[PDB]
Design an enzyme around this catalytic site. Structure first.
Site, PDB file in Angstrom:
ATOM      1  N   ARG A  25       0.822  -1.205   0.000  1.00  0.00           N
ATOM      2  CA  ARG A  25       0.000   0.000   0.000  1.00  0.00           C
ATOM      3  C   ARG A  25       0.859   1.259   0.000  1.00  0.00           C
ATOM      4  NH1 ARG A  25      -4.926   1.302   4.360  1.00  0.00           N
ATOM      5  NH2 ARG A  25      -5.473   3.337   3.467  1.00  0.00           N
TER       6      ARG A  25
ATOM      7  N   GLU B   1      -5.675  16.657  13.540  1.00  0.00           N
ATOM      8  CA  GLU B   1      -6.772  16.427  14.475  1.00  0.00           C
ATOM      9  C   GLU B   1      -7.504  17.722  14.809  1.00  0.00           C
ATOM     10  OE1 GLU B   1      -7.733  13.455  15.103  1.00  0.00           O
ATOM     11  OE2 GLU B   1      -6.002  12.547  14.108  1.00  0.00           O
TER      12      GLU B   1
ATOM     13  N   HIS C 179      -9.670  18.600  11.990  1.00  0.00           N
ATOM     14  CA  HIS C 179     -10.876  17.787  12.126  1.00  0.00           C
ATOM     15  C   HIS C 179     -11.847  18.413  13.117  1.00  0.00           C
ATOM     16  CE1 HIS C 179      -9.436  14.916   9.436  1.00  0.00           C
ATOM     17  NE2 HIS C 179      -9.360  13.835  10.191  1.00  0.00           N
TER      18      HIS C 179
ATOM     19  N   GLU D 238     -11.296  13.955   6.382  1.00  0.00           N
ATOM     20  CA  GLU D 238      -9.890  13.583   6.293  1.00  0.00           C
ATOM     21  C   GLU D 238      -9.157  14.421   5.259  1.00  0.00           C
ATOM     22  OE1 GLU D 238      -7.844  11.772   7.956  1.00  0.00           O
ATOM     23  OE2 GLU D 238      -9.298  11.045   9.430  1.00  0.00           O
TER      24      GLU D 238
ATOM     25  N   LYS E  28      -3.355  -6.712  -9.583  1.00  0.00           N
ATOM     26  CA  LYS E  28      -2.096  -6.351  -8.941  1.00  0.00           C
ATOM     27  C   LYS E  28      -0.972  -6.258  -9.963  1.00  0.00           C
ATOM     28  CE  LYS E  28      -1.827  -5.717  -4.390  1.00  0.00           C
ATOM     29  NZ  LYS E  28      -0.908  -4.765  -3.708  1.00  0.00           N
TER      30      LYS E  28
ATOM     31  N   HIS F  52      -9.578  -3.158   6.218  1.00  0.00           N
ATOM     32  CA  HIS F  52     -10.923  -2.772   5.798  1.00  0.00           C
ATOM     33  C   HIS F  52     -11.690  -3.948   5.211  1.00  0.00           C
ATOM     34  CE1 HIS F  52      -8.122   0.611   5.677  1.00  0.00           C
ATOM     35  NE2 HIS F  52      -9.131   1.363   6.074  1.00  0.00           N
TER      36      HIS F  52
ATOM     37  N   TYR G 220     -10.154   6.466   0.873  1.00  0.00           N
ATOM     38  CA  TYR G 220      -8.811   7.037   0.824  1.00  0.00           C
ATOM     39  C   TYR G 220      -8.552   7.734  -0.506  1.00  0.00           C
ATOM     40  CZ  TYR G 220      -8.278   4.143   4.939  1.00  0.00           C
ATOM     41  OH  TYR G 220      -8.434   3.572   6.180  1.00  0.00           O
TER      42      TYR G 220
END
Lengths: 49, 597
Positions: B255, B357, B360, B384, B463, B487, B497
């Site tokens: 990832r 944060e 947020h 996000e 992939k 997830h 994302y």
């Protein structure tokens, strides 16, 4: 109402004063500070009106 | 009188109850996370059960309200966000089975422990053992062993459980009037009833595919450069034409390639921009960093943070008598309660995550005036995105120089900018092909397009194709490598994302336009820009009260997602990678594999 509550959720005591001036004689007013009582000298004065 | 008026009254009553109930639940959660005790677990269970029962009762009492006769957009949106039965649309037994399978998969992913054949009693979990092994240890054998052992002892167990969970979610979505559970998750971005701003579930797939194909040249060049560097590191393990091994990408799933940055740094001799030493010299701590973040957010125009935050929120490690999760979390507990739970240390990473944060929290308090149902982000990729743009703005060298952390004599050169851009690429666009392929594979799995007997044999295809990454060893259908991620094994949408990355790039571009920054996009700082902050708050206050397409239009002028801001951000890096890949093959070969000689 908790001590950890948010600023907008903490308790607030509020008093609302409505100064009604209806036909009845005026009752509440300011102190109307009694100035020092000078004498034997030309001075403008005001005693209870 | 009318059904709409009764629905409005019912929604108002539900909101009034929900404010207090969710406040109690959030307070219990804050106490448990700050102090993990058995009593904290007990009150957490009590609050969660109460909240869930209340939500289900309100959903049942709302489903009887017909949504077609309601003309108020806000009321209809609130009801449909409430009337969502979800997996409860199935029978009690099927829902119980689905929940049990979800819990089993979550446990297997969390408790997944692999034992080396040398010492059977010596076993390591995914975190911190396997993750450290695959992110720091550069040995081919150790990484391959960890990767294969995980995908065997976890994939084989999860494959029947994952299949049954998939079919249960699919039948729930079918009973929820969705073609598949992939469509059920795509319905989150779905917008209806707004002329010029409606969004369809398949439009999400179309936009994601279009944006990925736009990124495809840049990703191909980045993959070519990374593969060239890895050949400079592992000439006998990676073919210049073949795809990259899955276990040699800094993580199990490939990832994030930022762990390969040390192996793929453009200029290793160029110092990295870090003012952590300056923070130590200036004796900055959690309170100082938070105060600087608040000052910066006041400079951009956002209102000063409440002091009740300081009274309630925790900034450092709460000692050792009580145990607390030091993960950076922003808590909007409701009823005027905003906090941040994180143990902040003296480093640039903690600086950026604290700014994330608190951004947020600022977004959460922006839409606080909205009703309880509307006190949330418009989509899973908006909040996000705000946090990421705040972290990026806080990481600008100009801001560091202004606050005195970065000394003025520090010089900015092309090599340092290239290193920063490449690190940002490995962090951000390293997962975008992986996110896209995993999301598309999940979409087809939920739709049933990929049969079980080819599942893995299909997965490793994309992939090799979408990501250009080949598994080091072949995996049969017993393997559940997609479920090897959090997830997939915990039923979380993964397109969030990609969507949040694109949203944050668009928002950053729009903020740089409003602030009228001059220079490269990655060097753009929104410090001392009141107009940009006002424009941002114009829809931060909206939250989810308005369609997310309308919010995005009000920011960047585009009603749909695109990677043009990403192209502007990485254009110098794109040119540098294209120049570097003149001798290194650009692309990948699906046929080649490390297990085939």
């Amino acid at each position: 109402f908790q001590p950890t509550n948010g600023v907008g959720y903490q308790p607030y005591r509020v008093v609302v004063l409505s100064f009604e001036l209806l036909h009845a004689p005026a009752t509440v007013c300011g102190p109307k500070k009694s100035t020092n009582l000078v004498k034997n000298k030309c001075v403008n004065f005001n005693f209870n009106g | 009188s009318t059904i709409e008026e009764q629905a409005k009254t019912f929604l108002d009553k539900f909101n009034h109850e929900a404010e207090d109930l969710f406040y109690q639940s959030s307070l219990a959660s804050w106490n448990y996370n700050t102090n993990i005790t058995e009593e904290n677990v007990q009150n957490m269970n009590n609050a969660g059960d109460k909240w869930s029962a209340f939500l289900k009762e309100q959903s049942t009492l709302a489903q009887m309200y017909p949504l077609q006769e309601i003309q108020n957009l806000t009321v209809k949106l609130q009801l449909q966000a409430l009337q969502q039965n979800g997996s409860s649309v199935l029978s009690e037994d099927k829902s119980k089975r689905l929940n049990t399978i979800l819990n089993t998969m979550s446990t297997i992913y969390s408790t997944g422990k692999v034992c080396n054949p040398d010492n059977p009693q010596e076993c390591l979990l995914l975190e911190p053992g396997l993750n450290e092994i695959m992110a720091n240890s550069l040995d081919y054998n150790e990484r391959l062993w960890a990767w294969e052992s995980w995908r065997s002892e976890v994939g084989k167990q999860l494959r029947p459980l994952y299949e049954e969970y998939v079919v249960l979610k699919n039948e729930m979505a079918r009973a929820n009037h969705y073609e598949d559970y992939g469509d059920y998750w795509r319905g989150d971005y779905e917008v209806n009833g707004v002329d010029g701003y409606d969004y369809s579930r398949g439009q999400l797939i179309e936009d994601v595919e279009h944006t990925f194909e736009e990124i495809k040249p840049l990703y191909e060049h980045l993959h070519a450069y990374v593969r060239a560097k890895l050949m400079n590191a592992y000439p006998s393990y990676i073919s210049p034409i073949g795809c990259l091994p899955a276990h040699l990408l800094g993580d199990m799933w490939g990832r994030f390639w930022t762990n390969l940055y040390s192996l793929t740094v453009p200029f290793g001799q160029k110092p990295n921009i870090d003012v952590t030493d300056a923070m130590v010299d200036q004796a900055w701590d959690a309170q100082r960093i938070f105060k600087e973040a608040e000052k910066f957010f006041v400079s951009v125009g956002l209102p000063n943070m409440t002091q009740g935050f300081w009274e309630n929120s925790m900034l450092t490690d709460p000692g050792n008598v009580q145990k607390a999760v030091c993960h950076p979390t922003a808590w909007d507990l409701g009823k005027g309660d905003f906090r941040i739970l994180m143990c902040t240390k003296v480093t640039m990473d903690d600086f950026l995550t604290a700014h994330h944060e608190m951004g947020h929290i600022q977004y959460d308090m922006a839409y606080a005036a909205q009703p309880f149902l509307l006190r949330n982000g418009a989509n899973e990729g908006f909040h996000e995105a705000v946090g990421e743009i705040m972290s990026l703005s806080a990481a600008t060298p100009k801001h560091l120089k202004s606050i005195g952390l970065l000394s003025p004599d520090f010089q900015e050169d092309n090599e340092t900018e290239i290193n920063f851009l490449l690190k940002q690429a490995l962090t951000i666009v390293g997962t975008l092909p992986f996110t896209y392929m995993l999301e598309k594979w999940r979409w087809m799995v939920f739709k049933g397009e990929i049969p079980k007997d080819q599942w893995m044999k299909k997965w490793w295809e994309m992939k090799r194709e979408i990501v250009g990454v080949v598994e080091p060893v072949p995996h049969d259908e017993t393997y559940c490598d997609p479920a090897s991620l959090f997830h997939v094994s915990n039923d979380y949408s993964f397109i969030r994302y990609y969507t949040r990355t694109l949203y944050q790039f668009q928002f950053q571009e729009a903020l740089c336009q409003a602030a009228k920054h001059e220079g490269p996009l990655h060097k753009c700082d929104i410090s001392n820009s009141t107009e940009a902050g006002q424009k941002l708050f114009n829809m931060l206050r909206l939250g989810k009260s308005e369609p997310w397409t309308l919010a995005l239009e009000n920011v960047v002028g585009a009603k749909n997602m695109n990677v043009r801001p990403l192209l502007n951000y990485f254009e110098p890096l794109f040119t540098w990678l294209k120049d570097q890949n003149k001798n290194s093959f650009v692309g990948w070969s699906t046929d080649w594999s490390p297990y085939a000689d």
